[PDB]
């Protein structure tokens, strides 16, 4: 219970028309920045337009770790995800826990003291770790989940690697956020800045979650890693919201509004790089160019990074990483597992890649001009 | 008693009957002689070895055209080889009354176009259409059966009357388990409607992953006898398995309306195929599958006597043509195959494509196992009935 937590609850289903004015103002860039971003985005898109096995990095963490050397030398880093989610039995949640535990040991040993920015890390889904994650009361779920996540966080602290909590459906944002707060106030994890958390910009609550996390970082002394994404579950959220007869949804219903929300939330994160580590996860060259110029000329490893999904982001970020390009780092999200554990992730990649509104679809669409692809969302909204 | 009391009571009783209680009758009905099993194994081995190597050892490929005119032009090649077509104007789960009206006009336009292209070839050799009832009512899964039926029935009857006037097939696709009962009641009213007399093009899908499947087939076969219609029956395994599992979990069910072990669906399919093959005087079985072992089993179960119109196989565009190029035609198995042909753009491909990904990407699917290095040809041709 706090003023910052109340802003989150109040925004849950705020009407879309009332959410946007503060985002538009925050996402408005100076003419100089807009012109520079348009130039960079054009260069990236011209390069791209000259360019489920593809989505999985390896079957095992040993296999995926071996395959990461080539791109790590080019300026990429990795976040490994042992595939698995939505556990329905205690046995499944225990197996996912042991998968994550063994991955941390292997990743942490491979990190070899490179630390949380230059070395690899791990991503986890809370729904893999509790057999009734979405069907039981949030209070009891968090309490049974807490010792498992704390144990994993303690292992990540032992090796000094990143451990990110992925974001899933909207009705579990609050639970996962409460877990993040308990961990960041837990003295057994002091001195480790590897805890990471995803916030989804297609959510109406996003900037208020970001206010809460930035303040939590500042008062806890933890430099929380914050992965800003647009979001992967849009079709399911819409279908659930429609089934519930809800007049106002927890997510935006126009893609341009999510784009404006992302840029507005990026501005908020870039103003807080003292206390959080922003991670800008996107495959959209206009979004990337905007953030690249919003961040200014000062850069050091550990200030911020970009991120991308394995099999989707490499052609864009080959134009970004390295000293002959933009000299900014990118962390590749690397799924690890069998084809069967991959299926649910694959479905969301199909919804992402196949949507006519998606950047990665439009980049191949002969009816979509480069002019349209470099359009600034605020000037279009 | 209430009309068809016993048949209707059997369907309701099976709805959520324990899986272990459903299987013994299906296994016995699915049992075939050793001679037939050896012959089917040899046929299945031949089909798989031909599959690979005509295709080097191995989602626009699922759509036949953006418009029905474009799709009909593209059908000429495979029709010349002896395939037929069932066109589906992509669209489902209408959320508005206006959307339901748009889908109805798409189906209506398509029947005129398909009927002209058919040019009197009839329901077996000529093309037909498939429809989804969820496209035609704006709250199909949410509204009371009274309201849905009373509004849906005139629209489906109007479409059936058009299909009768051109003598083409009109198939009702099967969707989620909770709409089986409504769709079956609609089938009954249409088959008893005298305005549709003399046309045998009405078709209906039954999903063998459902516990009700054999009792639904008993009801349909009896309906064909008392109505005098030869009902076209498409036997499938089922496309919504992942969604059905999730829905039953959220409904708090102790027992699901579908099987949870994949080989149980295989046994159910073969047992239901045996029931259909014994009733070809009053139904037209349509065996929809991409599984070469299932195909071979039904090919040998059906015996040596065949004529076009007895039964057919079916496949999805973009999935089944390589298998059935080893089936259609005098030098192959000399059995016909109807290709299900989606028609539309990306504004309508979505829901169907997700179900294709779940089908193609599942470790348990034949189309995935045929490319899996861990699966021997021995396993691909194994009779599932022998495993249980
Ligand atoms: C490294 C990485 C990690 C990620 N982690 C997560 C995670 O933990 N949880 C999560 O949910 N997502 C996560 N995502 C995001 C998700 O997987 C997609 O990759 C991302 O949303 C695509 O955005 P884009 O900027 O690349 O592309 P764009 O094409 O610019 O944006 C597409 C996005 O717009 C949104 N959208 C589409 N249509 C509409 C509409 N009508 N109304 C409103 N919004 C709409 C959706 O969010 C969609 O994904 C992650 C992405 C990356 C790269
Ligand atoms: C022409 C045609 C029309 C079709 N029409 C419809 C329709 O109207 N409605 C519909 O629902 N389906 C329909 N289908 C079926 C669906 O689209 C799939 O193509 C079909 O189920 C795949 O079965 P298969 O015999 O080709 O493959 P197989 O690999 O032999 O069987 C796979 C099937 O097994 C089932 N299954 C998978 N895992 C399990 C499990 N753990 N427990 C139990 N069962 C399991 C599922 O039904 C899955 O699709 C149609 C198929 C075709 C070819
Ligand atoms: O799982 C998803 O589809 C979204 C996502 C990508 C990386 C982490 O989460
Ligand atoms: O729509 C689905 O996925 C199942 C299906 C295939 C053909 C008719 O229905």
PDB file of C-alpha atoms in Angstrom, chain A residues 88 135 235 240 242 339-340 343 346-347 350-351 354-356 361, chain B residues 59 95 242 249-250 346 350 353-354 357-358 361-364 368:
ATOM      1  CA  UNK A  88      -0.096 -27.758 -14.326  1.00  0.00           C
ATOM      2  CA  UNK A 135      -5.711 -20.459 -10.890  1.00  0.00           C
ATOM      3  CA  UNK A 235      -4.417 -11.601 -28.736  1.00  0.00           C
ATOM      4  CA  UNK A 240     -10.091 -12.666 -22.339  1.00  0.00           C
ATOM      5  CA  UNK A 242     -13.998  -9.632 -24.589  1.00  0.00           C
ATOM      6  CA  UNK A 339      10.837 -28.926 -29.613  1.00  0.00           C
ATOM      7  CA  UNK A 340       7.902 -29.890 -27.370  1.00  0.00           C
ATOM      8  CA  UNK A 343       5.478 -24.976 -28.848  1.00  0.00           C
ATOM      9  CA  UNK A 346       6.380 -20.661 -30.989  1.00  0.00           C
ATOM     10  CA  UNK A 347       2.673 -19.763 -31.135  1.00  0.00           C
ATOM     11  CA  UNK A 350       3.697 -16.787 -35.072  1.00  0.00           C
ATOM     12  CA  UNK A 351       1.260 -14.144 -33.807  1.00  0.00           C
ATOM     13  CA  UNK A 354       2.462 -12.964 -38.986  1.00  0.00           C
ATOM     14  CA  UNK A 355       0.562  -9.851 -37.953  1.00  0.00           C
ATOM     15  CA  UNK A 356       0.239  -7.269 -40.698  1.00  0.00           C
ATOM     16  CA  UNK A 361       6.145  -8.351 -41.300  1.00  0.00           C
TER      17      UNK A 361
ATOM     18  CA  UNK B  59       2.025 -19.526 -43.831  1.00  0.00           C
ATOM     19  CA  UNK B  95     -17.970 -11.033 -32.762  1.00  0.00           C
ATOM     20  CA  UNK B 242      -4.773 -27.818 -26.830  1.00  0.00           C
ATOM     21  CA  UNK B 249      -9.032 -27.161 -16.689  1.00  0.00           C
ATOM     22  CA  UNK B 250     -10.593 -23.698 -16.352  1.00  0.00           C
ATOM     23  CA  UNK B 346      -4.111 -12.380 -43.536  1.00  0.00           C
ATOM     24  CA  UNK B 350      -4.856 -16.195 -38.122  1.00  0.00           C
ATOM     25  CA  UNK B 353      -2.759 -20.871 -38.914  1.00  0.00           C
ATOM     26  CA  UNK B 354      -2.358 -21.211 -35.136  1.00  0.00           C
ATOM     27  CA  UNK B 357       1.237 -24.664 -36.090  1.00  0.00           C
ATOM     28  CA  UNK B 358      -0.005 -26.690 -33.130  1.00  0.00           C
ATOM     29  CA  UNK B 361       4.828 -28.603 -34.361  1.00  0.00           C
ATOM     30  CA  UNK B 362       3.605 -31.231 -31.891  1.00  0.00           C
ATOM     31  CA  UNK B 363       5.951 -34.097 -31.045  1.00  0.00           C
ATOM     32  CA  UNK B 364       2.980 -36.477 -31.257  1.00  0.00           C
ATOM     33  CA  UNK B 368       6.320 -33.883 -37.219  1.00  0.00           C
TER      34      UNK B 368
END
